């Protein structure tokens, strides 16, 4: 089983480079699972505080599957504005919530295949939902940050072209106890250091170990 060189120390350096650091009240674990899924569906192209503001405005009215289905599209749009792609997210949340009401007893699904079939729910959100809502490690949630950093550090046997290719390559060697945590670490690492353009390699602890920085 192939594994990249120096990956242990590289992850140690990413842990040291992170910046400085609440938990919300849920009426029941079942309602929490729905709100966990909704926050994942709202975060696309959105700063975390804007997503939290939308979640706070939804909770202030009562954030359940039934109350969402009783909220018309225009009202739901004003509530989640200005999250990115808010008009599409209104459609995704209403259609998903109707699926959960009809077929899942108001709960969220408990498998990746069923989650990614929901409107506006991709494999990245599905693996995060499995970990956060059900406590299940089903896979690695690969966004553009994880895909870029894994290829810069050569954490894949060969360079991958798509995020789900990166997921399959990372899961072949990455220990399973790190599958959930690696998403939050690399997302932050890509946001503050390993930038999409002009990465801050001069101030990165991985420069002497990074194949991208060395060539
Ligand atoms: S040296 Fe540059 S490319 Fe390599 S991990 Fe650090 S920021 Fe990313």
Curated annotation (Swiss-Prot):
Active site as annotated: 124 (nucleophile)
A single cellular component GO annotation: nucleus
Subcellular location: Nucleus; Mitochondrion
Processing and modification events after translation: Ubiquitinated by TRIM26; leading to proteasomal degradation.
Record's signal peptide: none
MF (Gene Ontology): 4 iron, 4 sulfur cluster binding; class I DNA-(apurinic or apyrimidinic site) endonuclease activity; damaged DNA binding; DNA N-glycosylase activity; DNA-(apurinic or apyrimidinic site) endonuclease activity; double-stranded DNA binding; endonuclease activity; metal ion binding
Keyword Nucleus carried by entry: yes
Catalytic reactions of this protein: 2'-deoxyribonucleotide-(2'-deoxyribose 5'-phosphate)-2'-deoxyribonucleotide-DNA = a 3'-end 2'-deoxyribonucleotide-(2,3-dehydro-2,3-deoxyribose 5'-phosphate)-DNA + a 5'-end 5'-phospho-2'-deoxyribonucleoside-DNA + H(+)
Primary location class: nucleus
Quaternary context: Interacts with YBX1. Interacts with ERCC5/XPG; the interaction stimulates NTHL1 activity and NTHL1 binding to its DNA substrate.
Disease tied to this protein: Familial adenomatous polyposis 3: A form of familial adenomatous polyposis, a condition characterized by the development of multiple colorectal adenomatous polyps, benign neoplasms derived from glandular epithelium. Some affected individuals may develop colorectal carcinoma.
Name of the protein this chain belongs to: Endonuclease III-like protein 1
